Design a binder for this molecule. Structure first.
Ligand SMILES: O[C@@H]1[C@@H](O)[C@H](O[C@@H]2CO[C@@H](O)[C@H](O)[C@H]2O)OC[C@H]1O
Ligand SMILES: O[C@@H]1[C@@H](O)[C@H](O[C@@H]2CO[C@@H](O)[C@H](O)[C@H]2O)OC[C@H]1O
Ligand SMILES: O[C@@H]1[C@@H](O)[C@H](O[C@@H]2CO[C@@H](O)[C@H](O)[C@H]2O)OC[C@H]1O
Ligand SMILES: [Ca+2]
Ligand SMILES: [Ca+2]
Ligand SMILES: [Ca+2]
Lengths: 533, 533, 533
């Protein structure tokens, strides 16, 4: 009844939460602002965005954060009449260290004003709050080992959280070291039948990703490993369209059914290439999928081998679909930008992004380059399909090559492409292509830039994505289009192409304005179109 | 009279200001907080630190700033009853862009409470404020060109600044493109005779560095170039112990004499090595020197040819020397940290660095690792000599390998070495060595670390610097010192060694505490000693 | 009167030899076969190729030699009624070692069958045979030090050679260590007035290259260095069209005049670039220039300062001009290949390259690819001008992608471009472009290759080089020519571009046939043209 993935495009580390017959999934958002995206469902098939909880500087201040830093795996839970959301702001993403900070916020409702943060600890990412049967509370996260000779995933640490004291109490204790996969992270605790079950992710979030499960009658263990571990993995199944299956969380429904949600990468078509040499490139980044579970000797079993199935059988409820929460052609009609739009690291005030300066237009005042981890006037949405068209219509008069405005396909500060309006000494105002690949810049139309006539109020910019390749086009009138003669490869905006390993997001497409001169020049965007093909 | 360098260790981009018979030099401080150092002198020979102007988050907020970002070359001038300070906060320091913002702050007195910044522009670094005879004021700076087919140093832009509107007005114009040396930056304007003189730095701040001067009778040029340009340079003088001479400023003394201050690097000793192949390694970074000028046919000339002289004739005024402004041995009985101490990027409040918690001690609560561009509990002072000892006494009780405290010699987040106390599963509380070289970490004393006796309150940590090499040693009593069996090389803590080439600072020595578990564990430093040998 | 360079394109390490009023210059040929080129002149201005001495496998066997190995600096002298030629076959060109063996061969005549080699030593490249007034003979070369903590240019070794025993005798002894420039190599000995003069190259063969001279009254030293040393250098003359001035040999004329020949690199036009940042790219490799000397206090001085002159006054002799020694349009009617043509490493027999199989054609039977250091059916001549056209007309019927024939511009196995005929599964016989940069291959006409009509017998292939760029073109009928829309960059075929720094040759243009299948397929080339402008 359900076809994976359920959440498409950048949607990793799903954290499922049941409130009655209501289902929530919280995913990680990394450098993209605001922090955490929460989807609500009635049937687990159809998903709707209902919260974006970390929207105040007091809660999440990400300026300067590295690419793929920020909000890693979040944990959503419900207890004592309120939602508990745990999250990390990760500061260092490369080297011996992984500096980052674990915080708790709460709210009586899903889409309310969530509290200011309570500081937990810093010992490692993956934080999860356990609500025990006796009313005591426990935080589990991974424990980080920076030392030269050592594997960094020291195992799972656990420490009591005092609600009243608003702090962890007692001494932290390692309760589990993982199996021989290692890279043990993403711990979740569950009290089921007579056991504590400890769910982890192991093998790392590339092609060796697994969900491991263990159990103990004592919270502190020692835990004993599933006899047929891993619970879920893609590593044995190179032909499965769903790779990387791991970082799971478990739901017990109101219909006495069991499911497992997990991230998964969907590689691009690599027909005619070696099966096991390189398992692929995922521009849609890590998406959220859902597996059916079943129990056998006090152990859950993913229905249909420990590999992910494409289509499963859902829970015994009536289907509930949702109205489309965005315009295919978004004319900038509201007084708030559509909630699929995110900014990099920080909220953009009306001094930078505003619907109030020119009616029915998003206006962007130019800030820093596409390479800045600080202040970019950039509003973007996820690539959410392999085949799509996206388009925009923009008014812009640059007086210098320090100014630009354009349509950008973007991975991170060092990996992106763009069709942009700029200015040139001889040619005046022009259109041009620009790419950045691991910080190396190319201008494919250098010497042959497109002269924009003076009488043109609006330049129309379009990208057409067709799985492995995409192309840009322009129009001066809305009617007559022209392809720019350059084919781009989507694999270059994918998790798997990034040489750092710190590549935890996915491709975005959006609207950018840069003013390197500091003259507060701006571009008026009449609309932004995103349409699946 | 005057031996160079006048400001030793890290003191780049000297901007010199005359007020009557008082003399001030401002130098750049990059990622080090607080922003900008100002020194005073009566005779151009003896110099004391009198101001650290950019000490409010509102003036300078460098959280996340890259290494060698932040405060680049500043400009100090005096006019209309007050001091004017111009500065850049540089956000991007690698690739095609150099995103960064120029700001003006003022004060009636050199060590007053300077204004909050007035925003000027963002078009390039090296901003300078010119006050013309007719009362009018003008900003000059370099203009950045990001384009792939282009040299980035597009020339010198000039624009009128309206004190009344508190903004640049009219239209920006390029007034100078440079000479074939290119890398034209650091513009300063001078009205002399019936001429505007434009001074620039050219050829880049490494071994081809130079200072170039031009003249015009129109503020907007064309400027004719000095007939024997460069005005100053070490490039053709590979044996001059003073290298990289350039980024200069001119001072016309009250006694009708002319001088020129500039940065320089002093390479480590190089015998046995090709004179020209690699011209050296500068652990003291770029330092400040002074040269006499003399005039011919409407042109200035560095007395003693166009290379820098080691020793010069001071101005015709009485010698005025200054009492020492730090203690060789700092016992931490002050109410504030000695002004030769600095922190990374941000101010540290009493929650991180405190002289109050335990009188006679500096307490550092553990924050992030030595590789973090965010929050480090780290207090440090410049290497200002080739030959030195530096030493500290600390009590620390780490309970996990995630915590540490030590003596660090530091270039940047990826380049440092430390003798630190930490914790190990079997040995308990230990002394270890740790190094980071372009992010790659080494533990040279593994697994052969010093065991600290449970009964020892303070560990005594020392480093002895001898030009090319340095050594770490320790005592449990202050009297019986044992060397650690590793010889270190000072060239690895120099501008010239860093692969990125955003390397514009110099070596520091200081005190660090890390707590990556998040338990607020601290270290108490009873004293810090630094002594020239 | 004499305009430099006198030998144009790849002509390094000139060894000049006088015999009455006959003048000879031998240069290095590295991996190009046959080994060594000797040019003759009566006037030092006009030069004609007269000998290629190392043309037998017994003399020079270079199969598998690495790029820029094989025949390094040669030495040509005349004594006791015959010619003496010292050479090196360098086997190792990267790492701590420079494995290579020095050899002596002799001939009564410049252009006869030279003798078989007498092995000499192996201690360092740059061998030179000196002939003392008292009829004794000594060998000088450089001494090679492979050790980690050591500069590899240990200085100059000297040793006597015995004509009767056919070998070196007595003890080897260091006579010279070098100046602070180091990289001491290319030693030559002269006996003049009271002194022996020892000339060397220092600073390395890039932009720091120098000629260094020293004197002693004793053959074994010690040697006092010239007081205004270097004798010759371009290093302080960044504006000089002739760069890398070094590796000289001295000639005393029959007119009692003195000159110095030297190598030199002429960078491509550099307008807009920083003067000193990178001093240039030389696709014509290292060329041979000549300078005039005068004497003063027992020391020779380069007339015109110690930098090289573009134009000099030649010796007071009658001009002797030489007729052009190749056809602009080589129709391949001759019995042997023009002597400007070389092969890689080895000679090619009639089973690979023949003018005999097809009258009026050069036939190449396809062997191994362009990346092979073993057997290539490749016949090539030097780039000798910054603007030229080269062109060929070829008949070729490939039956597999494994077979190619074409026109190649070639630096080494890992750096080259080509316009070539091959075969395609669906399109059949096609014309394509291929490039290789540091072993990375591109096909810029991927998917748009030119279909060759089956009815066409000859494909005409042309390259037009214009200084910084060049462009390929083709025709089927030889009147109407189509440019392939790809603009190539000459700097990618230059010494300076090559990453290994074992880059000692220069760019060639030639004809190539590959048969990767082993079917002995061949290409018939009707002509080869080369023309300046
Ligand atoms: O927050 C999530 C984490 O679960 C994941 O953790 C690891 C980071 O370091 C790398 O060594 C591993 O590949 C990876 O599993 O980071 C990704 C994020 O989604
Ligand atoms: O403030 C000074 C700058 O003026 C200087 O700017 C240049 C930045 O680009 C680099 O490629 C060059 O090396 C450098 O000249 O850098 C140093 C800083 O102190
Ligand atoms: O015959 C010449 C050599 O003597 C010379 O070799 C040196 C080899 O190492 C490089 O680092 C130096 O720059 C170079 O001088 O050049 C090669 C050959 O032409
Ligand atoms: Ca609209
Ligand atoms: Ca004290
Ligand atoms: Ca012919």
């Amino acid at each position: 009844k359900i076809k994976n993935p359920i959440l498409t495009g950048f949607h990793p580390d799903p954290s499922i939460c049941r409130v009655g017959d209501d289902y929530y999934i919280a995913v990680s958002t990394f450098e993209w602002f605001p922090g955490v995206r929460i989807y609500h469902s009635k049937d687990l098939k159809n998903w709707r965005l209902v919260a974006r909880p970390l929207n105040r500087l007091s809660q999440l201040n990400m300026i300067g954060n590295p690419d793929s830093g920020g909000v890693w795996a979040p944990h959503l839970s419900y207890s004592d009449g309120k939602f508990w959301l745990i999250y990390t702001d990760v500061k260092v993403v490369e080297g011996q260290w992984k500096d980052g900070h674990n915080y708790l916020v709460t709210c009586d409702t899903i889409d309310g004003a969530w509290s200011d943060p309570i500081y937990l600890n810093s010992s490692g990412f993956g934080p999860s709050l356990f609500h025990d049967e006796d009313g005591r509370k426990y935080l589990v996260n991974m424990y980080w080992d920076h030392r030269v000779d050592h594997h960094p995933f020291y195992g799972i640490v656990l420490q009591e959280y005092s609600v009243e004291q608003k702090k962890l109490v007692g001494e932290p204790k390692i309760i589990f070291k993982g199996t021989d996969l290692r890279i043990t992270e993403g711990p979740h605790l569950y009290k089921i039948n007579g056991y504590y079950y400890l769910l982890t992710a192991e093998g790392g979030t590339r092609y060796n990703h697994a969900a491991t499960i263990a159990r103990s009658t004592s919270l502190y263990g020692p835990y004993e490993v599933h006899p047929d571990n891993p619970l879920l993995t893609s590593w044995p199944y190179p032909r499965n369209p769903l790779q990387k299956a791991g970082h799971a969380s478990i739901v017990h429904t109101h219909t006495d059914e069991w499911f497992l949600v997990h991230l998964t990468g969907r590689p691009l078509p690599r027909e005619g290439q070696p099966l096991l040499e390189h398992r692929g490139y995922c521009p849609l980044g890590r998406e959220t999928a859902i597996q059916r579970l079943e129990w056998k000797d006090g152990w859950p079993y993913v229905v249909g081998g420990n590999g992910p199935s494409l289509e499963i059988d859902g829970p015994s409820v009536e289907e509930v679909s949702w109205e489309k929460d965005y315009d295919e052609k978004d004319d900038f009609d509201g007084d708030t930008l559509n909630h699929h739009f995110q900014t990099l690291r920080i909220p953009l005030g009306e001094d930078i992004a505003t619907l109030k300066a020119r009616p029915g237009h998003l206006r962007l005042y130019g800030r820093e380059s596409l390479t800045s981890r600080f202040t970019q006037a950039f509003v973007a949405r996820r690539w959410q399909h392999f085949h799509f068209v996206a388009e925009t219509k923009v008014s812009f008069r640059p007086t210098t090559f320090q100014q630009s405005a354009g349509l950008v396909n973007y991975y991170n500060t060092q990996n992106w492409t763009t069709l942009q309006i700029t200015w040139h000494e001889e040619k005046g105002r022009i259109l041009e292509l620009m790419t950045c690949d691991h910080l190396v810049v190319d201008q494919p139309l250098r010497g042959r830039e497109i002269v924009v006539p003076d009488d043109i109020e609006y330049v129309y910019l379009r990208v057409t994505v067709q799985a492995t390749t995409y192309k840009y086009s322009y129009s001066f009138d809305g009617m007559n289009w022209i392809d720019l003669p350059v084919t781009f490869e989507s694999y270059k905006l994918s998790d798997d192409y990034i040489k750092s390993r710190a590549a935890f997001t996915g491709a975005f497409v959006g609207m950018h304005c840069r003013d390197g001169s500091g003259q507060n020049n701006y571009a008026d965007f009449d609309y932004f179109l995103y349409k699946e093909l």
